[PDB]
Design a protein around this ligand. Structure first.
Ligand SMILES: [NH3+][C@H]1CCc2c(Br)ccc(-c3ccccc3)c2CC1(O)O
Ligand code: NA
Ligand SMILES: [Zn+2]
Length: 868
């Protein structure tokens, strides 16, 4: 029987608490023996039994105060112990097999090392325990292993004991003084190179930093170490927070499902977010390592010192920590580029999730498998909700709320409501209506109409809002939407906002279904910038003219507004030509639209970081969100045709800007990164010029590149334009990098996203490639996931071959690695967005998976919602 769902309104405090736990591991890959001594305290009724969670455990013994216990019974996923006193010592001994753990949750094998992953509910795969985040205990961990095979034995906290044994075994004991929920426990055993450094806090605490990597990779760790130090200094300056322990350890592992994990004092990272060298890593990799390193470090306060009362409160730490890593990257790098890409993700990927059968509020109300809810909504929309609080309060009040949040809840497990109340009490801003953002799903739609009265010199905005019903909620109500505006006159000068002789704040409080806002002393009919900086996560409906948008592309004060205006301009003609493609007609584009992008290329006063993003066309997933019914083949071909048209009309300007931004020296510095993004944005268009010219330029950049950023941009362009040099370049890349999995991932992504007519045939053949393996999540997502998620034109082939391919892959991964399978099934859940003939084939595919033997709960939850 598949699992029953759990509901947020059923939360009840635990009948039993555990205050301290002493763990002993006798490590072995085939068999590990765990001994756990816990000090327990009963808070519930005297006749309530102790219910411990446990999965795939071989129980060996159960003692209460050293007495072998007889009043216990094992049930599905639990050990139930009865007739207990109010205080006692529980001792459990059980066995596990890390070598058989292909799901990568609990204690498992990563190559030759042993490591753990315990969030959300993985610790119960190690021993019987109260595997819930509102139980906080002080841990002490003793590890015993073969010295030659496992010379390094790591756990949370500080080393407090160590010894050697006979038969070549040794041991180390660790102690972590901060109580924690078990999902923050970590253990690592293996042989590593160690990069060691130090960081001194502003108050004088010296912290030892230790980065563990595979033998031979010390020259790939310096940037990660630098990013850690940068994270520690920034948190002090911006939030006034210092690290609270003596050591900070990071371990890079090749086999990892969840990107990275914030285990107290012992983070475990996917190698993709640690290792970097200029010849193997791109600018995006460097900046991703920075953001992930920061994200995990910032969890030390927003997550660890204050954790979650229950898993429905996940956004309490993830939304706030994402917001923190966004501010970190924005302060240190380009704020405009960070915001633009964060908005592309919201519009392009999160809106669709909110328009799917899996839609949920940032604080879910119902969950079957908690691992299915580490989502764009909980993370990305969660951060937008935090940012809206920052917008309503301001930086000063916002930090006051942070400090009150920590004062009240440091050392406990809190809820989302606790956080909002702290911000409300500290700032004196009423957030009662704002709380609805936590409980209501779906994307609000904000409609705006304006009117200028020359007689009275008044400008009136009539703003309405509505949220369409979602599969999970039939009731929707208006929200508190912060709506930021700016009014520009005929010269591009900002018009002061005022009413009745008093200034009016530029952040409007849109709180009702319909409302009017009147402004005085509007001397000239203005051009509005609406929803500035994406001030709320909503869809905007305003009948722009092409001239208003090109005006904003020229005169808007904030760089984000200039990019946003260009997106609105493109959207109108993306929709035009998709309709034309469906009727067999070629692309049509007014002359004045191409000229607006010509002016961007030739504007010497525009930040090249911004110009590069305006010259980056929306992705196929961003384009899909513009349509009621997705035609993935028309979207893909219209994107190419638009690229070809602009490449021909702007050929001369593109080549000039491309040559002007050449850089002989390669530096990982934001100004250098910006020029390089603008150069490679021009290269995308130039690849679609005359064949002989494009093939020479692309091949030249590939062979002369002194860094992987420029080499991969050329290789990507050769695949995208199907240039004659493609096959040769792709073979050289393979011949050179086939032994480096991280570098080959980029190669698989290009194969899976290729516009070639035989892409599926090539993808299937790559299942036997020397660098691919179904045992590594990174390889799976780079080839299979990129195909189903990032090549919808091929995944949605009219013959249904894409659906059948994915069914085969998921049949394997459902038994091997359900967590990775659940991420790969997401393209099938969106069937209702497509045409009826495609829906029929996709339902048939879901029905096949629905009838699998040993269907995991991960897929059962999604399949059930999809077929409803
Ligand atoms: N608590 C863990 C859960 C694992 C997880 C998943 Br699943 C998906 C995305 C991220 C992540 C998001 C942003 C930056 C870096 C990483 C994480 C890491 C985490 O949130 O620290
Ligand atoms: Na900055
Ligand atoms: Zn996180």
């Amino acid at each position: 029987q598949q699992p029953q769902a759990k509901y947020r309104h059923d939360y009840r405090a635990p009948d039993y608490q555990i205050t301290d736990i002493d763990l002993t591991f006798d490590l072995d890959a085939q068999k590990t023996v765990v001994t756990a001594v816990s000090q327990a305290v009963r808070h519930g009724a005297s006749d309530a039994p102790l219910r411990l969670n446990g999965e795939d455990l071989k129980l060996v013994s159960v003692h209460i105060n050293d007495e072998p216990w007889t009043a216990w019974k094992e049930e599905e996923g639990a050990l139930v112990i009865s007739n207990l006193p109010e205080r006692f010592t529980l001792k459990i001994i059980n066995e596990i097999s890390p070598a058989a753990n292909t799901a990568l949750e609990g204690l498992y094998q990563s190559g030759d090392a042993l490591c753990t992953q315990c969030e959300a509910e993985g610790f119960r795969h190690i021993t019987y325990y109260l595997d819930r985040p509102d139980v906080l205990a002080r841990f002490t961990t003793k590890i015993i292993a073969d010295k030659i095979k496992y010379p390094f034995l790591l756990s949370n906290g500080n080393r407090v004991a160590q010894g050697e044994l006979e038969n070549g075994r040794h041991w180390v004991q660790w102690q972590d003084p901060f109580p924690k929920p078990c999902y923050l426990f970590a253990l690592v055993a293996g042989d590593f190179d160690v990069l060691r450094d130090t960081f001194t806090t502003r108050s004088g605490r010296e912290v030892a930093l230790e980065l563990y990597v595979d033998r031979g990779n010390l020259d790939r760790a310096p940037w990660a170490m630098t990013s850690l130090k940068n994270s520690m200094k920034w948190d002090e300056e911006r939030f006034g927070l210092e690290y609270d322990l003596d050591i900070y350890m990071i371990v890079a592992v090749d086999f990892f499902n969840m990107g990275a994990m914030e285990n107290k004092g012992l983070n475990i990272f996917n190698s993709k977010y640690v290792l970097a060298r200029t010849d193997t890593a791109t600018d995006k990799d460097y900046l991703d390592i920075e953001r992930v390193i920061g994200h995990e470090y910032f969890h030390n306060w927003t997550g660890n010192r204050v954790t979650c009362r229950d898993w429905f409160q996940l956004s309490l730490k993830e939304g706030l920590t994402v917001f923190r890593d966004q501010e970190f990257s924005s302060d240190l790098g380009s704020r405009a580029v960070n915001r633009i890409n964060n908005v592309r993700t919201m519009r392009g990927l999160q809106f669709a999730e909110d328009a799917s059968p899996m839609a949920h509020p940032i604080r879910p109300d119902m969950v079957i498998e908690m691992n299915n809810f580490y989502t764009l909504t909980v993370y990305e929309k969660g951060a937008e909700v935090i940012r809206m609080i920052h917008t309503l309060l301001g930086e000063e009040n916002f930090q006051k709320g942070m400090q009150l949040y920590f004062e009240r809840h440091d050392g406990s497990a809190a809820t989302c409501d606790d956080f909002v109340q702290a911000m409300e009490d500290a700032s004196n801003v009423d957030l009662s209506h704002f709380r609805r953002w936590y409980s209501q799903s779906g994307t609000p739609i904000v409609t705006v109409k304006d009117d200028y009265n020359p007689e009275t010199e008044q400008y009136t905005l009539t703003i309405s809002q509505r949220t369409p019903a979602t599969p999970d909620q039939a009731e929707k109500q208006p929200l508190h939407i912060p709506f930021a505006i700016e009014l520009y006159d005929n010269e591009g000068k900002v018009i002061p906002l005022q009413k009745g002789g008093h200034p009016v704040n530029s952040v409007l409080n849109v709180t009702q279904a319909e409302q009017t806002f009147v402004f005085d002393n509007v001397y000239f009919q203005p051009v509005p910038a609406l929803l500035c900086e994406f001030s709320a996560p909503v869809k905007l409906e305003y009948k722009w003219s092409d001239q208003q948008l090109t005006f904003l592309m020229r005169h808007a004060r904030n760089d984000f507004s200039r990019w946003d205006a260009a997106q609105s301009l493109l959207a109108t003609y993306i929709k035009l030509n998709v309709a034309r493609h469906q009727q067999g007609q070629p692309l049509s584009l007014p002359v004045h639209v191409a000229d607006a992008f010509r002016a961007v290329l030739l504007d010497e006063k525009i930040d090249p970081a911004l110009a590069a993003e305006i010259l980056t066309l929306p992705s196929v997933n961003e384009m899909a969100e513009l349509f009621d019914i997705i035609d993935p083949i028309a979207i893909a071909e219209v994107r190419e045709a638009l690229t070809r048209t602009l490449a021909t009309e702007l050929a001369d300007e593109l080549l000039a800007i491309y040559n002007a931004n050449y850089q002989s020296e390669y530096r990982v510095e934001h100004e250098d990164i910006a020029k390089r993004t603008l150069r490679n944005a021009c290269l995308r268009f130039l690849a679609f010029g005359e064949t002989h010219l494009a093939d020479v330029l692309v091949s030249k950049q590939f062979h002369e590149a002194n860094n992987m950023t420029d080499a991969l941009a050329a290789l990507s362009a050769a695949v995208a334009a199907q240039l004659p040099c493609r096959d040769a370049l792709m073979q050289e890349y393979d011949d050179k990098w086939h032994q480096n999995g991280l570098v080959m991932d980029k190669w698989f992504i290009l194969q899976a996203t290729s516009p070639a007519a035989n892409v599926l045939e090539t993808v299937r053949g790559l299942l036997q490639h020397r660098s691919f393996t179904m045992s590594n999540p990174n390889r799976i997502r780079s080839l299979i996931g990129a195909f189903a998620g990032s090549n919808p034109a091929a995944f949605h082939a009219e013959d249904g071959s894409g659906y059948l391919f994915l069914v085969e892959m998921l049949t394997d991964l459902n038994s091997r690695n359900p967590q990775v399978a659940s991420r790969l099934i997401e393209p099938l859940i969106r069937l209702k967005r497509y045409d009826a003939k495609r829906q029929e084939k996709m339902r048939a595919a879901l029905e096949q998976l629905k009838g699998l033997e040993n269907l995991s709960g991960d897929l059962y939850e999604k399949i059930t919602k999809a077929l409803a």
